[PDB]
CSV table of C-alpha atoms and ligand atoms in Angstrom, one decimal:
chain,number,residue,atom,x,y,z
L,1,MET,CA,-15.4,9.0,-9.9
L,2,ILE,CA,-13.0,8.6,-7.0
L,3,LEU,CA,-13.8,10.1,-3.5
L,4,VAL,CA,-11.7,10.3,-0.3
L,5,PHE,CA,-13.5,10.8,3.0
L,6,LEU,CA,-11.1,12.6,5.4
L,7,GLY,CA,-11.5,13.8,8.9
L,8,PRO,CA,-11.3,13.0,12.7
L,9,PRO,CA,-12.4,9.6,14.0
L,10,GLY,CA,-16.1,9.6,14.9
L,11,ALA,CA,-16.9,12.3,12.2
L,12,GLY,CA,-19.4,10.0,10.5
L,13,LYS,CA,-17.3,9.0,7.5
L,14,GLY,CA,-18.1,5.3,7.6
L,15,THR,CA,-21.8,5.9,8.1
L,16,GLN,CA,-21.9,8.3,5.1
L,17,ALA,CA,-19.7,6.0,2.9
L,18,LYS,CA,-21.9,3.0,3.6
L,19,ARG,CA,-25.0,5.0,2.6
L,20,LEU,CA,-23.4,6.5,-0.5
L,21,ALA,CA,-22.1,3.0,-1.6
L,22,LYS,CA,-25.5,1.5,-1.0
L,23,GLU,CA,-27.7,4.0,-2.7
L,24,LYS,CA,-25.4,5.1,-5.5
L,25,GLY,CA,-23.3,2.1,-6.3
L,26,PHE,CA,-19.8,3.2,-5.2
L,27,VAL,CA,-17.3,0.6,-4.2
L,28,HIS,CA,-16.7,1.2,-0.5
L,29,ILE,CA,-13.1,0.8,0.5
L,30,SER,CA,-12.9,1.0,4.3
L,31,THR,CA,-9.4,0.2,5.5
L,32,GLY,CA,-11.0,0.0,9.0
L,33,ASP,CA,-13.4,-2.8,8.0
L,34,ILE,CA,-10.8,-4.7,6.0
L,35,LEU,CA,-8.3,-4.6,8.8
L,36,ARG,CA,-10.8,-5.8,11.4
L,37,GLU,CA,-11.8,-8.8,9.2
L,38,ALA,CA,-8.1,-9.6,8.7
L,39,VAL,CA,-7.6,-9.4,12.5
L,40,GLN,CA,-10.6,-11.7,13.1
L,41,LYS,CA,-9.5,-14.2,10.6
L,42,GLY,CA,-5.9,-14.0,11.8
L,43,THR,CA,-4.1,-13.5,8.5
L,44,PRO,CA,-0.5,-12.4,8.3
L,45,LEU,CA,-1.8,-8.9,7.9
L,46,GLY,CA,-4.3,-9.3,10.7
L,47,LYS,CA,-1.8,-10.6,13.2
L,48,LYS,CA,0.6,-7.8,12.3
L,49,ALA,CA,-2.0,-5.0,12.4
L,50,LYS,CA,-3.8,-6.1,15.5
L,51,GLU,CA,-1.7,-4.3,18.1
L,52,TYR,CA,-1.4,-1.0,16.3
L,53,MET,CA,-5.2,-0.9,16.1
L,54,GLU,CA,-5.7,-1.9,19.7
L,55,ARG,CA,-3.4,0.9,20.8
L,56,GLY,CA,-4.9,3.6,18.5
L,57,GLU,CA,-1.8,3.7,16.4
L,58,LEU,CA,-1.7,3.7,12.6
L,59,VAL,CA,-0.8,0.4,10.9
L,60,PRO,CA,2.5,0.8,9.0
L,61,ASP,CA,2.1,2.4,5.5
L,62,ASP,CA,3.7,-0.5,3.6
L,63,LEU,CA,1.1,-2.9,4.9
L,64,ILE,CA,-1.8,-0.5,4.1
L,65,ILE,CA,-0.6,0.6,0.7
L,66,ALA,CA,-0.3,-3.1,-0.3
L,67,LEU,CA,-3.8,-3.7,1.1
L,68,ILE,CA,-5.2,-1.0,-1.1
L,69,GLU,CA,-3.5,-2.4,-4.3
L,70,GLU,CA,-4.9,-5.8,-3.4
L,71,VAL,CA,-8.5,-4.4,-3.1
L,72,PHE,CA,-8.7,-1.5,-5.6
L,73,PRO,CA,-11.4,-2.5,-8.1
L,74,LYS,CA,-10.7,-2.6,-11.9
L,75,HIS,CA,-13.9,-0.7,-12.6
L,76,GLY,CA,-16.5,1.4,-10.7
L,77,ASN,CA,-16.6,4.5,-8.7
L,78,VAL,CA,-14.7,4.3,-5.4
L,79,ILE,CA,-15.0,5.8,-1.9
L,80,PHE,CA,-11.8,5.8,0.0
L,81,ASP,CA,-13.0,5.7,3.6
L,82,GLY,CA,-10.2,6.1,6.1
L,83,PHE,CA,-7.4,6.0,3.5
L,84,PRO,CA,-5.1,7.8,3.1
L,85,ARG,CA,-4.1,8.6,6.7
L,86,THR,CA,-0.6,9.8,6.1
L,87,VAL,CA,1.2,11.9,3.5
L,88,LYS,CA,3.2,8.9,2.4
L,89,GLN,CA,-0.1,7.0,1.8
L,90,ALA,CA,-1.5,10.0,-0.2
L,91,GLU,CA,1.6,10.0,-2.5
L,92,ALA,CA,1.2,6.3,-3.0
L,93,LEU,CA,-2.5,6.6,-3.8
L,94,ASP,CA,-1.7,9.3,-6.5
L,95,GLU,CA,0.9,7.1,-8.1
L,96,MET,CA,-1.4,4.0,-8.1
L,97,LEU,CA,-4.3,5.9,-9.7
L,98,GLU,CA,-2.1,7.7,-12.2
L,99,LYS,CA,-0.9,4.2,-13.4
L,100,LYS,CA,-4.6,3.3,-13.9
L,101,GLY,CA,-5.4,6.6,-15.8
L,102,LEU,CA,-7.2,7.9,-12.7
L,103,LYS,CA,-7.1,10.5,-10.0
L,104,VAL,CA,-8.8,11.6,-6.8
L,105,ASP,CA,-11.8,13.7,-7.9
L,106,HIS,CA,-13.1,15.0,-4.5
L,107,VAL,CA,-11.8,15.0,-0.9
L,108,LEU,CA,-14.7,15.4,1.5
L,109,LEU,CA,-13.3,16.8,4.8
L,110,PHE,CA,-15.6,15.9,7.6
L,111,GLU,CA,-15.2,18.8,10.0
L,112,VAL,CA,-16.4,18.2,13.6
L,113,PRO,CA,-15.1,19.4,17.0
L,114,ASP,CA,-13.3,17.3,19.6
L,115,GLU,CA,-16.3,17.3,22.0
L,116,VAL,CA,-18.4,15.8,19.2
L,117,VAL,CA,-15.8,13.1,18.2
L,118,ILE,CA,-15.6,12.0,21.9
L,119,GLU,CA,-19.4,11.9,22.1
L,120,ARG,CA,-19.7,10.0,18.9
L,121,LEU,CA,-17.0,7.4,19.5
L,122,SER,CA,-17.8,6.6,23.1
L,123,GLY,CA,-21.4,5.8,22.2
L,124,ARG,CA,-20.6,3.9,19.1
L,125,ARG,CA,-21.8,0.3,19.2
L,126,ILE,CA,-21.5,-2.6,16.7
L,127,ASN,CA,-23.8,-5.4,15.7
L,128,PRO,CA,-21.2,-8.3,15.7
L,129,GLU,CA,-23.5,-10.3,13.2
L,130,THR,CA,-24.1,-7.6,10.6
L,131,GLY,CA,-21.5,-4.9,11.1
L,132,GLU,CA,-24.3,-2.3,11.5
L,133,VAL,CA,-23.0,0.7,13.4
L,134,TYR,CA,-25.2,2.3,16.0
L,135,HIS,CA,-24.9,5.0,18.6
L,136,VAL,CA,-26.3,4.7,22.2
L,137,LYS,CA,-28.0,8.1,21.9
L,138,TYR,CA,-28.3,9.2,18.3
L,139,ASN,CA,-29.2,5.9,16.7
L,140,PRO,CA,-29.6,3.2,19.4
L,141,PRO,CA,-29.8,-0.5,18.6
L,142,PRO,CA,-33.3,-2.0,18.4
L,143,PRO,CA,-34.6,-3.6,21.6
L,144,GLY,CA,-33.0,-7.1,22.1
L,145,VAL,CA,-30.2,-6.6,19.7
L,146,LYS,CA,-26.8,-7.4,21.3
L,147,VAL,CA,-24.1,-5.0,20.4
L,148,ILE,CA,-20.5,-4.5,21.4
L,149,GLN,CA,-18.1,-1.6,22.0
L,150,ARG,CA,-14.9,-1.7,20.1
L,151,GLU,CA,-11.8,-1.9,22.4
L,152,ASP,CA,-10.4,1.1,20.5
L,153,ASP,CA,-13.5,3.2,21.3
L,154,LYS,CA,-12.4,3.2,25.0
L,155,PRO,CA,-11.6,6.6,26.5
L,156,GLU,CA,-7.8,6.5,26.4
L,157,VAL,CA,-7.6,4.9,22.9
L,158,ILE,CA,-9.9,7.6,21.5
L,159,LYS,CA,-7.6,10.2,23.0
L,160,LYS,CA,-4.6,8.5,21.3
L,161,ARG,CA,-6.4,8.1,18.0
L,162,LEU,CA,-7.1,11.9,18.0
L,163,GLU,CA,-3.5,12.9,18.7
L,164,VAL,CA,-2.5,10.5,15.9
L,165,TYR,CA,-5.1,12.0,13.6
L,166,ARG,CA,-3.8,15.5,14.4
L,167,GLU,CA,-0.2,14.5,14.1
L,168,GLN,CA,-0.2,12.3,11.0
L,169,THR,CA,-3.5,12.7,9.2
L,170,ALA,CA,-4.4,16.3,9.5
L,171,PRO,CA,-1.6,17.4,7.1
L,172,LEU,CA,-3.6,15.8,4.3
L,173,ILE,CA,-6.0,18.8,4.5
L,174,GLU,CA,-3.4,21.2,3.1
L,175,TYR,CA,-2.2,18.4,0.8
L,176,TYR,CA,-5.5,18.1,-1.1
L,177,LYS,CA,-6.4,21.8,-0.6
L,178,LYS,CA,-3.3,22.6,-2.7
L,179,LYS,CA,-4.8,20.5,-5.4
L,180,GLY,CA,-8.2,22.3,-5.4
L,181,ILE,CA,-10.3,19.2,-4.7
L,182,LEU,CA,-10.9,19.7,-0.9
L,183,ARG,CA,-14.6,20.0,-0.1
L,184,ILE,CA,-15.8,20.9,3.3
L,185,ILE,CA,-18.6,18.9,5.0
L,186,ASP,CA,-20.2,20.2,8.2
L,187,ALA,CA,-20.1,16.7,9.9
L,188,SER,CA,-21.5,18.0,13.2
L,189,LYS,CA,-25.1,18.0,11.7
L,190,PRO,CA,-27.6,15.1,11.9
L,191,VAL,CA,-27.0,12.1,9.6
L,192,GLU,CA,-29.6,13.0,6.9
L,193,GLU,CA,-28.3,16.5,6.6
L,194,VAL,CA,-24.6,15.5,6.2
L,195,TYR,CA,-25.7,13.1,3.5
L,196,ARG,CA,-27.5,15.8,1.6
L,197,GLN,CA,-24.3,17.8,1.7
L,198,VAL,CA,-22.3,14.8,0.6
L,199,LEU,CA,-24.6,14.4,-2.4
L,200,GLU,CA,-24.5,18.1,-3.3
L,201,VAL,CA,-20.7,18.1,-3.1
L,202,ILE,CA,-20.3,15.3,-5.5
L,203,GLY,CA,-23.2,16.1,-7.8
P,1,ADP,N1,-5.4,4.0,6.2
P,1,ADP,C1,-4.9,3.5,7.4
P,1,ADP,N2,-3.6,3.6,7.7
P,1,ADP,C2,-3.1,3.1,8.8
P,1,ADP,N3,-3.9,2.5,9.8
P,1,ADP,C3,-5.2,2.4,9.6
P,1,ADP,C4,-5.8,2.9,8.4
P,1,ADP,N4,-7.1,2.7,8.4
P,1,ADP,C5,-7.4,2.1,9.6
P,1,ADP,N5,-6.3,1.9,10.3
P,1,ADP,C6,-6.2,1.3,11.6
P,1,ADP,O1,-7.5,0.9,12.0
P,1,ADP,C7,-7.9,1.7,13.2
P,1,ADP,C8,-9.4,2.0,13.0
P,1,ADP,O2,-9.6,2.8,11.8
P,1,ADP,P1,-11.0,3.2,11.2
P,1,ADP,O3,-12.0,2.2,11.5
P,1,ADP,O4,-10.8,3.6,9.7
P,1,ADP,O5,-11.3,4.7,11.8
P,1,ADP,P2,-12.4,4.8,13.0
P,1,ADP,O6,-11.9,3.8,14.0
P,1,ADP,O7,-12.2,6.3,13.4
P,1,ADP,O8,-13.7,4.5,12.3
P,1,ADP,C9,-7.0,2.9,13.1
P,1,ADP,O9,-6.8,3.5,14.5
P,1,ADP,C10,-5.7,2.4,12.6
P,1,ADP,O10,-4.9,1.7,13.6
P,2,ADP,N1,-24.4,12.9,11.7
P,2,ADP,C1,-24.3,12.1,12.8
P,2,ADP,N2,-24.9,12.5,14.0
P,2,ADP,C2,-24.8,11.8,15.1
P,2,ADP,N3,-24.2,10.6,15.2
P,2,ADP,C3,-23.5,10.1,14.1
P,2,ADP,C4,-23.5,10.9,12.8
P,2,ADP,N4,-22.8,10.1,11.9
P,2,ADP,C5,-22.4,9.0,12.6
P,2,ADP,N5,-22.8,9.0,13.9
P,2,ADP,C6,-22.6,8.0,15.0
P,2,ADP,O1,-21.3,8.4,15.5
P,2,ADP,C7,-20.4,7.3,15.6
P,2,ADP,C8,-19.3,7.6,14.5
P,2,ADP,O2,-19.7,7.3,13.2
P,2,ADP,P1,-18.8,6.6,12.1
P,2,ADP,O3,-19.4,6.7,10.7
P,2,ADP,O4,-18.5,5.2,12.7
P,2,ADP,O5,-17.5,7.5,12.2
P,2,ADP,P2,-16.1,7.4,11.4
P,2,ADP,O6,-16.3,6.4,10.3
P,2,ADP,O7,-15.8,8.8,10.9
P,2,ADP,O8,-15.1,7.0,12.5
P,2,ADP,C9,-21.2,6.1,15.2
P,2,ADP,O9,-21.7,5.5,16.5
P,2,ADP,C10,-22.4,6.6,14.4
P,2,ADP,O10,-23.6,5.9,14.6
């Protein structure tokens, strides 16, 4: 089975993907995580991607599509978490899967309002050692655990990332709706509840 998690930044897509991968054995493909590790290690991809990400812009499709080809696993169920982000990327994903005898089974659309995305993103914190994602209010780091805020979770980059989401990524909703595989998730609910809905959606 192949899943795509779609929706605004801060919706809780990564948090759910990591849980689903962990408990149910999906391969988690987070273009976010892979890009950040590239940036940190300073690869050709990392150096090229770094500024797009810092500014809240999408990294160019060619770079991402190639990144997906490089990481797509030969076997196993897959969660596409943060990819595709454009219509071009969605077309590429279809072709790539079709060549492998595959297809996207379910697109979970993580619906959540702007005030919730801003609330979620501004309080997001990261454990630099473990990659564990926290939230200053909803799931705070344990006492004594040093965390960081991502530079792209600053107020003005969030604002940009949301315009970019609405401009470039939101058309994917009709794209997958037209195929009859769009599932709606009420992402505004607490973590446990969203996860139950995710499990119910996918069986
Ligand atoms: N599929 C993609 N296509 C283009 N750029 C991407 C993609 N995934 C991630 N990025 C870059 O990485 C940044 C952070 O993405 P990500 O971590 O997936 O979302 P969020 O920051 O909302 O969790 C994006 O703003 C974008 O610049
Ligand atoms: N259901 C939820 N309720 C409250 N906070 C959440 C929920 N899901 C995730 N979060 C928190 O909100 C922020 C965004 O979650 P994340 O999974 O990183 O979003 P995305 O991957 O869609 O950008 C994180 O700080 C996370 O701890």
